[PDB]
Design an enzyme around this catalytic site. Structure first.
Site, PDB file in Angstrom:
ATOM      1  N   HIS A  77     -27.737 -63.074   8.545  1.00 39.26           N
ATOM      2  CA  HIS A  77     -28.637 -63.553   7.517  1.00 39.26           C
ATOM      3  C   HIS A  77     -28.013 -64.630   6.555  1.00 39.26           C
ATOM      4  CE1 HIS A  77     -32.183 -60.562   7.881  1.00 39.26           C
ATOM      5  NE2 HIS A  77     -31.672 -60.925   9.041  1.00 39.26           N
ATOM      6  N   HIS A 244     -28.470 -57.473  18.822  1.00 36.62           N
ATOM      7  CA  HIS A 244     -29.232 -56.228  19.027  1.00 36.62           C
ATOM      8  C   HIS A 244     -28.545 -55.289  20.077  1.00 36.62           C
ATOM      9  CE1 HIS A 244     -33.021 -58.064  16.900  1.00 36.62           C
ATOM     10  NE2 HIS A 244     -31.959 -58.007  16.100  1.00 36.62           N
TER      11      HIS A 244
END
Ligand code: HEM
Ligand code: HEM
Ligand SMILES: [Cl-]
Ligand SMILES: [Cl-]
Ligand code: NA
Ligand code: NA
Lengths: 713, 713
Positions: A77, A244
């Site tokens: 992020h 992920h």
């Protein structure tokens, strides 16, 4: 309290040119972050980060007893706000800890992640910046969980206030497209310079486009946003599947349980937000995105399980406990561990955007190749993670510490090493005299060096004159650069270079990059002489010439100027008034308002305008370095009116006779209109200001010539 | 572009602490305005201004062939924004040329006045500031029309961006009272710190209160607003009658003919505004306020014709051509000249607010005295005009040039000259050792010096430790200053002073003002020594002691702190959150956000809180100069909650045990809440920061001690 912004909401805003003031900076004006970092014991920091991974705090218990996944998201992020359109966003200034990014919905509970790092930040102090620490922590989380990173560079200095970035026009967090401030038009076209599909997201909506769970259409948004963050298909699939492989999402209960984001919370929250009323509010009960997905059977260890699951099951649409769309594996056993209760197990789950990697045809081929060849997956993810987290750091000369990768990557716009003696002051004087004897004019010399150096932007520290990329595709063909004229200047400079170099001993040579800049300097000197002044323009040699093969033409295309008020150039008609685009350019060039003013005034009178336009050339001695622009612009004897043909061009007529004296654009006239800019123009337009104007111009010229010179820094 | 201010409209705003950045200033960092001004040929500037008064330009023809009236209004508007509550507004920074003041409705057509001055500004350049020029031009207008001014001082340095001043909450220019953002409550009580009756006015509405033409009620608003600008009844009558001896108002046609104020006008207007579609739009056809009044028979010459007319006629309510209420003399001859047509004459006219001078009973007595004794009127006006235009210039030491009046005025808070040798470094060391040997504690020394120096405000440059007025009424009795404790400290310091002075030769002595500051320095050195650090605190002697007879007690009342976050003091319950009041105080003290942060943290641990409150005293070594405030504030092992008794007090408890560790206010805890302030706290709270903390504290302490020391400029 009513403000100027309330009364005159469309007036130009110059406060973006004074962020980074030494008023807001607590460090001395002498503080050099590179030096502080170079003394840090980076190995000791990494040990402490390794220990932190499994030291759970009760105020935010670690999933699976390991904060690794949370920290990789945190780092991703931090980097993932980056847009190639302007170079803004990215991890390089640690903006995640300031408004608005600290409080974007996609950064929910990253406040907790940053707070977990405060003890380490405190222990090492100024020798490691927040900006550096956020990326390093990501790296260490990868390493702790069995993934070998490609490397790491320090040197991201901390900033002390929010940057003014345009993140979109919506007045509602997460507004779906087609609203009154829509970032989308036509066939799902995202407006430049934005690189996210909704206000407050990093890239895309994990449920699918505007919440519709179609993986095929989600793929399209993924491809578009990631491209605008510099990532191709291969990098995109490596990054999403790589990330992920770790951790989980958090959606244990309805989102209405979650309170105020950090910037809205009460003072007692001490800088944190999203306090949740659902059960304990944390750990097993955590709510972040509202989704409830855990991807792999070993969320705290690197594995090849993401693509095993993605391909090995068929997927059924379902809802999380908060009501969000997500996918569950048809008929699977409960093989995925619970984050807190060893007695529970769950079926494999996926986000719509994970399924994109399989149902988009181009992604599917890459995903399958990665499934079949996990080593290629691992290498691609390591390379993309390095690129993602270093993309905005600028030239390799800025990279610090002992983990910098030796391999030179195309995306870094690399500059060859200099391996020969540089020219000295006698050589520089000789080269300038040859440049002036060749017949090149002031206007050609100034225009060419301006074109070369003014591609720099401080946002991601790409561009500038180093490299001599002005002679290569695509810069040599950009309309703002006047390709035919440019070709003729470069041909004369190349001949001068070749002759100088052939006459040397000892291997001394001059690069074309240095000679372009040096020639620009000779033009400014000549201009000062034309006005009757003796001026020396500083010059620092040391640039090298990059090759075409070291210059990625598609990546270079985002540096093309479509607006350059310093050359009175606008490539088409835009939403944004031309003067707003001038201030935007000044910001990227790292100029203050006074620097922008002097620079523009001088360039007008030197003949730097594209196409030799007369617009703003308010002098009868063009190619002489004077303050005429300012004295004539401010002359009340002239009256200005927009033209019939074009409302963005103005005619300046003698007030008494009616005779046409000048024409200008909005970029020219805003210096006579905006009350702060006109105050700056008045200084340079005064009777005592000729010498100050020359001095100040030479200084800003030299500043711009050296913007990318981090080899001297 | 959605901004942080849009998303979090009530979050604290720190950008007021970084106006005056050297980024926005075009003059070098070494530029000294006083030096430039002191070589200006002021006589030659006044000659040029004199010539200007009768040189009409066709773009704004001069009424009666004389610009004097317009320039007086310009200078009066430049000064007349001043409020005594915070010292903000006034002429001392030339803010009339910036937003919003450049575009206030009451400053309509002053843009033309400023433009008329550009040729002279341009000729003299940096040696005369705009701020000085505006006032000088007013003076020269008065002189050219036969009025003897009291004097003039230069030294108002130009500013380069708008100040952030609270001018009211209305969202509509000129909104009548009682709206959703009413500045009025109770029995017509105007909210502090405002000094005008409507948004965009200087003082009052010339038609009367909210446009109701009752001169008696208008008198009330006049008295209230002028008092808030530091002017009593005598000065008020002198100023209004004096100004309205000259020139005229402009209301030749309906106001809807008048276009956009300067900040809203098109770029081609080149910084002017209020372009009028009524007939020629200027001169005879001018519209400014919408009123059409010419007060005297010789609008370009000083006279006592304003009071002759005021008292010599009875007055009838009438309407101007724009529809505004105004007054005309019943049955008078046409004796007033027309501004452009020698063949026309008009009857005497008056504003409602002019008639206030006659129909308010207290004003009437003064107006009559002035009518009967016009020499008294002239003297009063000259004195008031000097005060009005110099009120925000600060101590007499800042007044430059050859026309400074020699008379010392009580409103100047005058400081006696020093006529003896000053203490040297050895003497200062001896005095510090005596102060420490007396038994005075670190907390008493710090508190007392803080109380004395921290009355300074940079807005009008009033206050500070020079003068030793802390020992006099009313400062000695202010609650924030802890009157009984203060009296005991002063008694000890006075005995130390008396003994030192009695032991000297050669006339050397120390003032109590200097000894209060020096004692505070000893307290900070002792505190550093208590923490294990040897530092010397810089000290500059030269303050003097003013007497009670040289101190206007009523004028001193507005300097009382009712909110001082640096001593955790709030005198009562307010509208405004205490953290907003801290940032307001920091701005008045001229502090950056880093300076405010260090200073507060140090003062907490030194014992400077009023009443010995424990709030924010986050240390177990009080009276030692450490960074404990920051380390303990930022310790995530502590959890904070508002108390049941008081929502503005917070308990900090151990997160694990629940044990009470600390208490604090909103002023303490904002440093752990606000994202930019917490980033600053982190620097000073890090493990490498103890020496930086001490050094930076000593520097800001010393800055505060020297705020009023313009004698050393
Ligand atoms: C299309 C792109 C992506 C989307 C839509 C997306 C969506 C999300 C969402 C919704 C979460 C859950 C947040 C929560 O509820 O706690 C999350 C978690 C995470 N993502 Fe992504 N993601 C994307 C790409 C990436 C990339 C490029 C990386 C890293 C290289 C990454 C690494 C992570 C990790 C590690 C977590 C787990 C956090 C934890 O364990 O607390 N993702 N992702
Ligand atoms: C109650 C206080 C005051 C009120 C309501 C007031 C009101 C006004 C108004 C409405 C105008 C006309 C603006 C226009 O249409 O051109 C004006 C003009 C003027 N005022 Fe005042 N005034 C006040 C006090 C002062 C003071 C204190 C001075 C100076 C000492 C001053 C000097 C002038 C002058 C010289 C003009 C003439 C402008 C010209 O000739 O162009 N006034 N006044
Ligand atoms: Cl940014
Ligand atoms: Cl102000
Ligand atoms: Na950036
Ligand atoms: Na002021």
């Amino acid at each position: 309290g009513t403000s100027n912004r309330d009364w005159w909401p469309n007036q130009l805003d110059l406060s973006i040119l004074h962020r980074h003031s030494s008023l807001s900076d607590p460090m001395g004006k002498d503080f050099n972050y590179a030096q502080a970092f170079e003394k840090l014991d980076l190995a000791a920091v990494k040990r402490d980060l390794h220990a932190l991974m499994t030291t759970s705090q009760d105020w935010w218990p670690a999933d699976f007893g390991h904060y690794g996944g949370l920290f990789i998201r945190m780092a991703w992020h931090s980097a993932g706000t980056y847009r190639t359109a302007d170079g803004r966003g990215g991890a390089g200034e640690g903006q995640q800890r300031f408004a608005p990014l600290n409080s974007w919905p996609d950064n929910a509970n990253l406040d907790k992640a940053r707070r977990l790092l405060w003890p380490i930040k405190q222990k090492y102090g100024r020798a490691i910046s927040w900006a550096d620490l956020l990326i390093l922590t990501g790296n260490v989380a990868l390493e702790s969980m069995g993934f070998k990173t490609f490397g790491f560079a320090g040197g991201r200095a901390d900033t002390w206030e929010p940057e003014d970035v345009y993140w979109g026009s919506e007045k509602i967090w997460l507004e779906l497209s087609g609203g009154p401030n829509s970032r989308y038009s036509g066939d799902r076209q995202l407006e430049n310079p934005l690189a996210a599909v909704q206000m407050g997201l990093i890239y895309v909506n994990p449920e699918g486009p505007d919440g519709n769970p179609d993986p095929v259409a989600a793929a399209r948004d993924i491809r578009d946003t990631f491209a605008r963050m510099a990532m191709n298909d291969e990098e995109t699939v490596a990054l999403i599947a790589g990330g992920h492989t770790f951790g989980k999402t958090h959606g244990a209960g309805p989102a209405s349980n979650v309170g105020a984001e950090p910037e809205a919370a009460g003072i007692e929250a001490q800088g944190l937000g999203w306090k949740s009323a659902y059960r304990t509010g944390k750990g097993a009960d955590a709510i972040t995105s509202g989704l409830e997905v855990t991807w792999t059977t070993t969320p705290t260890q690197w594995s090849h399980n993401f693509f095993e699951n993605l391909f090995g099951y068929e997927w059924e649409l379902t809802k999380s406990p908060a009501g969000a769309h997500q996918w569950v594996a048809k008929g699977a056993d409960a093989v995925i561990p619970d984050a807190f209760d060893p007695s529970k197990k769950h079926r494999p789950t996926m986000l719509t955007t994970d399924l994109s990697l399989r149902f988009d045809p181009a992604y599917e081929k890459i995903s399958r190749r990665f499934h079949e060849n996990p080593e290629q997956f691992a290498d691609a993810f390591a390379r993309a993670w390095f690129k993602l987290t270093h993309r905005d750091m600028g030239p390799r000369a800025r990279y610090l510490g002992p983990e910098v990768p030796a391999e030179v990557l195309l995306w870094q716009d690399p500059i060859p090493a200099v391996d020969h003696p540089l020219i000295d002051a006698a050589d520089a004087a000789e080269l300038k005299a040859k440049v002036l004897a060749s017949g090149l004019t002031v206007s050609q010399l100034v225009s060419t060096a301006w074109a070369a150096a003014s591609t720099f932007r401080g946002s991601d520290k790409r561009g500038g004159a180093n490299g001599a990329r002005i002679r290569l595709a695509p810069q040599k063909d950009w309309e703002a650069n006047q390709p035919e004229q440019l070709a003729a200047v470069l041909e004369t400079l190349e001949a001068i270079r070749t002759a100088f170099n052939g006459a040397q001993r000892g291997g001394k040579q001059v690069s074309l990059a240095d000679l372009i800049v040096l020639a620009g300097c000779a033009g400014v000197e000549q201009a000062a002489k034309n006005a009757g002044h003796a001026v020396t323009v500083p010059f620092a040699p040391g640039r090298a010439d990059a090759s075409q093969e070291q210059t990625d033409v598609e990546s270079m295309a985002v540096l093309e100027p479509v607006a350059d008020g310093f050359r009175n150039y606008l490539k088409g008609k835009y939403r944004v008034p031309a003067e707003v685009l001038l201030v935007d350019k000044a910001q990227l060039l790292t100029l203050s308002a006074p620097e922008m003013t002097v620079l523009l005034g001088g360039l007008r009178v030197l003949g730097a305008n594209v196409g030799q336009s007369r617009h703003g050339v308010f002098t009868a001695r063009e190619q002489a370095l004077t303050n005429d622009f300012f004295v004539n612009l401010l002359d009340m004897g002239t009256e200005w009116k927009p033209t019939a043909a074009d409302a963005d061009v103005f005619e300046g007529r003698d007030r008494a006779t009616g005779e046409l004296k000048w024409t200008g654009t909005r970029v020219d006239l805003v210096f006579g209109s905006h009350s702060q800019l006109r105050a700056l123009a008045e200084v340079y337009g005064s009777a005592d200001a000729q010498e100050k104007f020359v001095r100040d111009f030479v200084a800003v010229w030299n500043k711009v010539m050296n913007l990318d010179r981090f080899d001297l820094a």
